[PDB]
Amino acid sequence: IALFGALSWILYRADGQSKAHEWIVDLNLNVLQAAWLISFSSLIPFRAVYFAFRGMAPATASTLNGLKTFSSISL
Amino acid sequence: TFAQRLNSSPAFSSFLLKREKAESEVPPSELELEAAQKAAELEDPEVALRTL
Amino acid sequence: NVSANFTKFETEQLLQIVATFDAFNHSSVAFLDDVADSITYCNHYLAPVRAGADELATLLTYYAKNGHERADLLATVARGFSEVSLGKLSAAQRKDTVLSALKAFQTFGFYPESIEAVIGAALVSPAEYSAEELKEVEAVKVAAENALGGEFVLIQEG
Amino acid sequence: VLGEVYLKDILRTPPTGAIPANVPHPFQTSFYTYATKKLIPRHWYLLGGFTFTITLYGILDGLRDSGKKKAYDEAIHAGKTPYTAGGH
Amino acid sequence: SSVRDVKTGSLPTNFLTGVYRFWRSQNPAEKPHDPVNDRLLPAVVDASDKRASIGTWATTFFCTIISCNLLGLMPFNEAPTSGLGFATGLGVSVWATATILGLSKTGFKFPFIFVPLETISYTFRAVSLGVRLWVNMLAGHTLLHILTGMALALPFSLGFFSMVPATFGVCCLLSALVGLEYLVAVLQSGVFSILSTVYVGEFNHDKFIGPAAKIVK
Amino acid sequence: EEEELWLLTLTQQFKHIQKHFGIDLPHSVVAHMDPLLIKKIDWETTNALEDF
Amino acid sequence: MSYSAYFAKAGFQFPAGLSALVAGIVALNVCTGRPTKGTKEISNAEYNATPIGYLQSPDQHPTAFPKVPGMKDVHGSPHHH
Amino acid sequence: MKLLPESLQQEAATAAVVASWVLWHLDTQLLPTIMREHKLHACWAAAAKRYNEKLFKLNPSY
Amino acid sequence: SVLAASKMVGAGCATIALAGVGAGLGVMFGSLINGAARNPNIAKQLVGYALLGFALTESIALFSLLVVFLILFA
Amino acid sequence: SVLAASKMVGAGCATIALAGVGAGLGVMFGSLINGAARNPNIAKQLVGYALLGFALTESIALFSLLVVFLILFA
Amino acid sequence: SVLAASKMVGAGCATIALAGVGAGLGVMFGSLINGAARNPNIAKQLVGYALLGFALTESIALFSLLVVFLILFA
Amino acid sequence: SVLAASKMVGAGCATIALAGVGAGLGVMFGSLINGAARNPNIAKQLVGYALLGFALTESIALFSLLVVFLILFA
Amino acid sequence: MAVTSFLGKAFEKYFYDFSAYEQFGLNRFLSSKGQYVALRHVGFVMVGVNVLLAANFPFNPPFPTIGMCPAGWEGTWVCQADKAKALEMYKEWKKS
Ligand SMILES: [Zn+2]
Numbered sequence A: 001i002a003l004f005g006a007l008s009w010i011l012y013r014a015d016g017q018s019k020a021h022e023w024i025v026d027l028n029l030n031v032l033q034a035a036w037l038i039s040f041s042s043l044i045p046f047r048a049v050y051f052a053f054r055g056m057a058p059a060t061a062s063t064l065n066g067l068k069t070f071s072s073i074s075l
Numbered sequence B: 001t002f003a004q005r006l007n008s009s010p011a012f013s014s015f016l017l018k019r020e021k022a023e024s025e026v027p028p029s030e031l032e033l034e035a036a037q038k039a040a041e042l043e044d045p046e047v048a049l050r051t052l
Numbered sequence C: 001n002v003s004a005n006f007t008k009f010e011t012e013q014l015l016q017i018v019a020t021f022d023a024f025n026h027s028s029v030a031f032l033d034d035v036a037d038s039i040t041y042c043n044h045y046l047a048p049v050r051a052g053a054d055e056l057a058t059l060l061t062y063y064a065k066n067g068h069e070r071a072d073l074l075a076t077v078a079r080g081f082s083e084v085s086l087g088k089l090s091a092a093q094r095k096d097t098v099l100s101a102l103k104a105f106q107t108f109g110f111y112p113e114s115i116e117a118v119i120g121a122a123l124v125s126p127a128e129y130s131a132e133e134l135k136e137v138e139a140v141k142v143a144a145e146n147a148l149g150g151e152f153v154l155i156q157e158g
Numbered sequence D: 001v002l003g004e005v006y007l008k009d010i011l012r013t014p015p016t017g018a019i020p021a022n023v024p025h026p027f028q029t030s031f032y033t034y035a036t037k038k039l040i041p042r043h044w045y046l047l048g049g050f051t052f053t054i055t056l057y058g059i060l061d062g063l064r065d066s067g068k069k070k071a072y073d074e075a076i077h078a079g080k081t082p083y084t085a086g087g088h
Numbered sequence E: 001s002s003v004r005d006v007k008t009g010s011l012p013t014n015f016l017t018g019v020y021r022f023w024r025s026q027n028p029a030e031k032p033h034d035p036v037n038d039r040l041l042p043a044v045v046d047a048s049d050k051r052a053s054i055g056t057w058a059t060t061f062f063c064t065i066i067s068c069n070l071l072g073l074m075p076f077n078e079a080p081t082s083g084l085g086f087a088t089g090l091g092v093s094v095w096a097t098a099t100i101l102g103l104s105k106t107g108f109k110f111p112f113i114f115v116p117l118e119t120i121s122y123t124f125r126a127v128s129l130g131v132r133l134w135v136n137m138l139a140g141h142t143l144l145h146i147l148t149g150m151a152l153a154l155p156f157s158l159g160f161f162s163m164v165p166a167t168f169g170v171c172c173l174l175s176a177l178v179g180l181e182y183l184v185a186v187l188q189s190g191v192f193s194i195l196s197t198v199y200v201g202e203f204n205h206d207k208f209i210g211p212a213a214k215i216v217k
Numbered sequence F: 001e002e003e004e005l006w007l008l009t010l011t012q013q014f015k016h017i018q019k020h021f022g023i024d025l026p027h028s029v030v031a032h033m034d035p036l037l038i039k040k041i042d043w044e045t046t047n048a049l050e051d052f
Numbered sequence G: 001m002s003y004s005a006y007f008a009k010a011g012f013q014f015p016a017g018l019s020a021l022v023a024g025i026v027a028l029n030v031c032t033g034r035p036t037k038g039t040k041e042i043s044n045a046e047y048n049a050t051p052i053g054y055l056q057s058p059d060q061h062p063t064a065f066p067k068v069p070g071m072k073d074v075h076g077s078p079h080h081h
Numbered sequence H: 001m002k003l004l005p006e007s008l009q010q011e012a013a014t015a016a017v018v019a020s021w022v023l024w025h026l027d028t029q030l031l032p033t034i035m036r037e038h039k040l041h042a043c044w045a046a047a048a049k050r051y052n053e054k055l056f057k058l059n060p061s062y
Numbered sequence I, J, K, L: 001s002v003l004a005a006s007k008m009v010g011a012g013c014a015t016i017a018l019a020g021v022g023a024g025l026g027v028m029f030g031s032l033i034n035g036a037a038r039n040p041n042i043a044k045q046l047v048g049y050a051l052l053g054f055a056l057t058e059s060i061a062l063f064s065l066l067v068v069f070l071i072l073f074a
Numbered sequence M: 001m002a003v004t005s006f007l008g009k010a011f012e013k014y015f016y017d018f019s020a021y022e023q024f025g026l027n028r029f030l031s032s033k034g035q036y037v038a039l040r041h042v043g044f045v046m047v048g049v050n051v052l053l054a055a056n057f058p059f060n061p062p063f064p065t066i067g068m069c070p071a072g073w074e075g076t077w078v079c080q081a082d083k084a085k086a087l088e089m090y091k092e093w094k095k096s
Helices: A002-019 A023-043 A046-056 B002-007 B030-041 B045-051 C011-023 C029-040 C053-065 C071-077 C083-087 C091-108 C113-123 C131-148 D031-077 E011-025 E041-050 E054-071 E084-105 E114-156 E164-201 F004-020 F027-033 F035-046 G004-009 G018-030 G044-049 H008-058 I002-014 I017-038 I040-072 J002-038 J040-055 J058-072 K002-038 K040-071 L002-015 L018-038 L040-072 M003-017 M033-055 M083-094
Strands: C152-154 E213-215
Touching: A002 A023, A023 E114, A023 E164, A023 M033, A046 E011, C011 C029, C011 C053, C029 C053, C029 C071, C053 C071, C053 C083, C053 C091, C071 C091, C083 C091, C083 C113, C083 E041, C091 C113, C091 C131, C113 C131, C113 C152, C113 E213, C131 C152, C131 E213, D031 E054, D031 E084, D031 F035, D031 H008, E011 E054, E011 H008, E054 E084, E054 E164, E054 H008, E084 E114, E084 E164, E084 H008, E114 E164, E114 I040, E114 J058, E114 K040, E114 M033, E164 I040, E164 K040, E164 M033, F004 F027, F027 F035, F027 H008, F035 H008, G018 H008, I002 I040, I002 J002, I002 K002, I002 K040, I017 I040, I017 J002, I017 K002, I017 K040, I017 L018, I040 J002, I040 J040, I040 J058, I040 K040, J002 J040, J002 J058, J002 K002, J040 J058, K002 K040, K002 L002, K002 L018, K002 L040, K040 L040, L002 L040, L018 L040
Parallel strands: none
Antiparallel strands: C152 E213
């Protein structure tokens, strides 16, 4: 449903962009935006971005500091 | 190790992180590597009973 | 049912249940321990803060009438008594709640740091209190002064 | 000994049989609990702001429609076309 | 009636945790005079009850505005924010939220010629908060459309594969413009939510019902 | 072994949580293992104390 | 081991209340009260009287990839005052 | 190019619907999950010392 | 078409304010460089102020451009 | 006619007064960055003055914009 | 006729906004030089700030160009 | 023709924008001299930044000259 | 047998393994990889605008020409500035 709705939205928006008055600059704006979506796949350091987002949350920034072994031992 | 567990996580199976390894961002310490080796050695419970 | 799955019950539900069980004289030892365990350990420690001091005073008089002493539950439901929760009440209801809470705290011999917000609620406005009720409040006030380790003053606006 | 009945709903081990269902929050369960517990007591200022902006923009649409209908009325009373036809 | 399962430590959970903690940190709670303990805990809880949820509101506005602003940069797509009614409705909504909070603090009472001048100076926040973000989104799309036409004209009147350096230069300029539009999308979402936090934090202040009676030692 | 079940279940539950937490632990396994902690956490989100 | 296969089991899933969002946006775009942009509410006798091409205005049917800016697909109502 | 839309109230109501859905989804679906992870980690990190001292005092194994 | 002629003249005279807002914005960003050079330990704080400052400064440009739109396409 | 033409011309001339307002906002926020780099421990307090200064500068922009609509829509 | 003439006049008058953004960029890059002289150990970082400032200042510059191309061609 | 006459006036008004470019350029080069005087050891490096800043400011001048072209010969 | 599995694996092999910065040996002509990414970005834009313009042409452009034609249509029906005149000239050009 998501892929077919995205394709139907892309086709409907490209159709309406074709019907529009400045149609060729619409279809070239699509190229100018797809170029940046291409270049973001090449530029962004996704491992460093992943670990930066891991540092954004305190639940993933540190290890769990909780129960220690010497307290809950049972001899 | 924590880096090996991150490599086996779903997040490093996703498309933008297929070829990445978590050791390259933060490598495990010498204590963490020797403790992973020690825990793999103690995963046999009979070996843990004999060692203790 | 309450004693079977006491961990599932929330504090507001237990306060309504204990109010009904206090209207009648119905109590077991196991039911009292399970309600106190559920309010103390199984529930959030700020759940008496969202309660309203009349419900907590009903629970305190319930445990005082049945003689069940649980100092952890007393330290939990003493948190709900403050200037805020007693200020939410009307004047007659605040007088009744202060008398019930002070009588229960004197019965248990337990004087927390938050008893003074009860005692102050009787001493900021002592016009509604009779002479024997003021003697009761002053008895609990002297007892709390001896337990907490100092003398009881009122704080003004500044 | 300390049996398993003391640990019944307090403390559990990691699952060996199957992974259970996720326990819902009370807000995920019902919209009534979200609406009466958090949406109205906490976010009624934001809802009043949205109500004010929709009311105000309805007022502005009313003013625009009144001005447009006035221009249309004097245009058809003057005998001229209110709208330019254009070229197709 | 069954909810979905969530992995702990997912990237959207971590991103939204950082974003929420940011917009919550914009309006910090005041330290009381007394030390915080069980005597002071209902005062702290009631102080949190009287404080408006500007962290949730600012996270809401940040997420919706950065989503629409980044929708403007996907292909075959314009931003909803570049519409006048959308962005200025969000702006008037934040201004009315701050005003409704401040009015409810003063007992629902509306507020020596300094008072109409300060009234106009405060009322212009409703215009400025929406017109800034809406104008920035509208200007960026309009600038790209005008710039794209000039770039299209260069290879339309100089051959498709006959003028390489000037077409390369003007497409470098257009590509740098779209990168600037990415930066402006992120920046204007952050700016809208920061000004939202300061406008509502003007009225977030309330009375701390502390202890009226105490044991002194 | 009078109380070894309670100590050992605390050790095992925290070892599983700490082993899997930021990496791949589902929320359902957490709410299974510690249901009362999830209940006390849900009380804060319910009563608008999620930033307490 | 790990819970990776457990999360790979569940497919793509929408945000939890997205149907309410799409329902609200669609109900705002179709329940307007005013007629559709370009069209005019005419009488039923006039609607049954005119043919299809005369009822369609040329401004509402622009050419898909127009060679000249302003080309319209249909030419409506040559019979006019 | 027109500045004003066909209805300002329709666009304002669209903005209100989108932002109110983001508010409900944030408060209902996102913030419970976020606070489950965050408050688990934060409760353990805040109670590690008191918890281990209390459990050390309860433990008769030493 | 003297009205449309004055519309073009009025919009071209209307965008003079972008000069003053650009001079001010360059002053503010040069001071951001200066303040980062004085005290870089709080530099990531200062950039935030700079963005906020740029924010409000940018608004004076947009109230210019809005008038241009109110001259051109109203 | 010529009157509405002059309304467009005078509105474009009247919104030139936002140039110095943008320049002054830039100078003020640049000074805010410099003063926060100079004394960060009072930095939040300085931001208050900045907002206060902002609230007394953009009013001048209001006195331009109130004229502009008075040239346009009156 | 008159409209194309006023389009030339207005597109010329809209260009003078580029003067103030040139002055602002010059002030910002001169402050980059001063801050690089005062603290070279963070100098590369300051260049990044300059480029960031450049980007935002260029937006105002491009805004002026927008009106030129909204008058000259549109 | 009045079109070519207005092209002359519009090209003059577009040429006015070179003033602030020259002013910011002079400010940047004066700050180059001042930063080399405060710190000569890195001075050639500062000249690099100066040329960098110069080039970016020339972009604005380029844009202004572009507009003169689009008034004069288009 | 499945289509989306092969599509995912093929796009992975094209995204990660296939690199025309080393396959064509572009490290001699270009300095670094980021320079290649910038030039491939601008080359993508150039090829896209030329494919669009080249795709459907000859047409009267809605974008403002700077007084320059395609060198084969001085005043036919492509360089016309008035749009209705260009439309009727397109009609008498389409009848041919
Ligand atoms: Zn567009």
